[PDB]
Amino acid sequence: PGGFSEYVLWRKKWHAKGFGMTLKGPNDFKLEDFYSASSELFEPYYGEGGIDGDGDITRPENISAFRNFVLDNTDRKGVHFLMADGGFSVEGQENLQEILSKQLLLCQFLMALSIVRTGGHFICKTFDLFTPFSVGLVYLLYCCFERVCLFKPITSRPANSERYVVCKGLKVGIDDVRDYLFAVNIKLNQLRNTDSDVNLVVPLEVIKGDHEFTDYMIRSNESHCSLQIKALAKIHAFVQDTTLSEPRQAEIRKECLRLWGIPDQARVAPSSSDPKSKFFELIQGTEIDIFSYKPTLLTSKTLEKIRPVFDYRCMVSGSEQKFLIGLGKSQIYTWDGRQSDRWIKLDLKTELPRDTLLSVEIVHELKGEGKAQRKISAIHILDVLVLNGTDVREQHFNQRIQLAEKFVKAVSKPSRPDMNPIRVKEVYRLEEMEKIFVRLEMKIIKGSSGTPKLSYTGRDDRHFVPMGLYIVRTVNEPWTMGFSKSFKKKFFYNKKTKDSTFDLPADSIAPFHICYYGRLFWEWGDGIRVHDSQKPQDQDKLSKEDVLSFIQMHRA
Amino acid sequence: MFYHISLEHEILLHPRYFGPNLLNTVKQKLFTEVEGTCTGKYGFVIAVTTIDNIGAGVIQPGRGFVLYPVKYKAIVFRPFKGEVVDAVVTQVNKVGLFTEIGPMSCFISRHSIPSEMEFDPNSNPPCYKTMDEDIVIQQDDEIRLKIVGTRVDKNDIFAIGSLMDDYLGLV
Amino acid sequence: EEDASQLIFPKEFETAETLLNSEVHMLLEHRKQQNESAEDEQELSEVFMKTLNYTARFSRFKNRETIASVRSLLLQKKLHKFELACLANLCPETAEESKALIPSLEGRFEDEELQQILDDIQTKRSFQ
């Protein structure tokens, strides 16, 4: 049940995205029992068929499928590190544990070589390493990574054969070893229930030819053997005498928790908080009226407000703006910003970690046109305040959007096409609003009686009906961005002190409340021409040409 | 079907509500009492087109209010058994389908929906779709349903639609 | 007891005169305009709003002259009021669909004449 991932996610919050595969059944993942996290933080993928697979890592189909999945969600680079902790019951034949799980070990090393990015790390649980098969696998890891070691932590029980192999810095050009181990695993699958077996993956002469590797391997095996022998005899003596005990367990545990930075406080806090109380907890005394501010409509009378241009970013809206709070798993609630409105539970199949506070809109995404058109409701994030517990409201708007893409890439669902997608809005520089209109198309929407409707097409082959365009200021009070024609670079100018700098001043950063309060909205209703096929241009309403001309005049 | 018929209704006017203009009060009374109503024999009373004839006012013996028999052209609607009607989908459910025909709620059970149109809560809008995903019946769609029949009730003729026969489903 | 597939109507719905969706939209919008003027009169029923918006979404004949032309072209055809209104509202494109949506049109008109009438409908349909 992803205890490793529970630690990593509890320590990294929304700043980590995890991909998990394990055997289905009684020992499957338990997402709902993670102290932190959510289904859209540690996303399980069970091989061929996606979430309908069995998760058997020893199947070539599952290996290739999970590899493709991980690559598709890591910019085709792979994961920064992989952890493997595979094991199963060897009751009645415990002494043959290493042999009985040789294929599991090989498949975990192969998965490391398959999804770990260059320079990435890898930690895997092993057992006894007496056979040349396991030692050859360790030798392959030692050839593939920049540094390898065999380690047994004190949280591994001293009487068992459990240890861990720790690998850092995956080398470039390990693909031949990857293909070779894939083929070896296939042969292993073909020799099941037969009298044959793959007994060597690296010739004994090659392993012993490296004197340093063999010296380390022998010394590790022998020191672990002596410690385990002492621990086993100790357990036996404690069986033959039930009065014996270690009187130091409490103090040792205390010191270990202090050393590792693990707080000595239980899980027991279901946080069955109502969304309103949790919202007040998360805003930490910030005035609630800040969340009720309506946007300033962009008109010919308010066009001068966007005069700096470089101070602003813009995004295409598809629905009314709402606030969203995540209390863990499917306990997601939305609020429309008015003190009188109640928090409404979100009727979408999606999950999000606790202690998450977002500014979102709920968009109807469309794929295809006409009678074949499919429609999906999606959460489109406009801005972020708190994610999974760490506050980001005071960070720069682009940084909040990047951390939003961080968490949001994490809060996604490729293995569960049955879940509602979460996305960040595409943020444009105001001096580049021209790029938005290139993505506006007139498409035949299901139920429009054949009338084409204006549609904004995103990064995938989906589109939505736009309601308008938000303009958000990202530079603070009497701080503004100009463009230096001599240096061909943007610079920050302080209107009060008259100072100028090419670096980002800390006090020029617009926090969330400034960005939200100062935002403008350019509605895209009837009579407004933003695409050349729809020209009922109401002369009192700003067109795309008017706004673009104003922007061009004030870029210089 | 949207109908333009003539209907007869009787209005009770009490002497406190005569006023200087008496017939305008009757017209307002008729536009108040019968607009938006529904009867089991005449269907959804949408609106009154033109108040044609105002009858003679019979003073009820002992009572004070006068009674006006009134004939009026009216726009109404009545669901029918077997009539193919366009509709707007309001909700897709694993049990049935909530659609609307004007003000009428129409419930199309999945048992009378062919095996091709399966239900999927897994799409973000729970919808009806096939494995080819060509016909995607979801919320706020323009569909056609052949009315199996209608539950004629007090101020309600909510109907049951069909998708079993040919050319039924998404427009 | 009643059946719209074989024109089985009650005796009350014998003098029932049908209306087109665009006709209903126009008349109810005129009623809404009357409600806009002539103050000291409250809003109409929820049924009024629902029917008005419902027939506004499904309106096919955007012009009253189009309504008159369709009514003149179909009223001179040997049809019942119900069949005429259903054809002018559903607006099928193939004669097979015309006979399938309305099973009471079996043999009323020749299928080539029926296809001519459907093509006339598609000619007089105000596109959007």
UniProtKB/Swiss-Prot annotation, chain A:
One GO CC term, this protein: nucleus
EC number(s) on file: 2.1.1.57
Keywords noted in UniProt: Acetylation, Methyltransferase, mRNA capping, mRNA processing, Nucleus, Phosphoprotein, S-adenosyl-L-methionine, Transferase
Subcellular localization, as worded in the UniProt entry: Nucleus
Entry keyword Methyltransferase: yes
Gene induction: By interferons alpha and beta, and by Vaccinia virus infection.
Domain RrmJ-type SAM-dependent 2'-O-MTase span(s) in chain numbering: 1-171
Subunit structure: Interacts with POLR2A (via C-terminus).
Protein name: Cap-specific mRNA (nucleoside-2'-O-)-methyltransferase 1
Organism: Homo sapiens (Human)
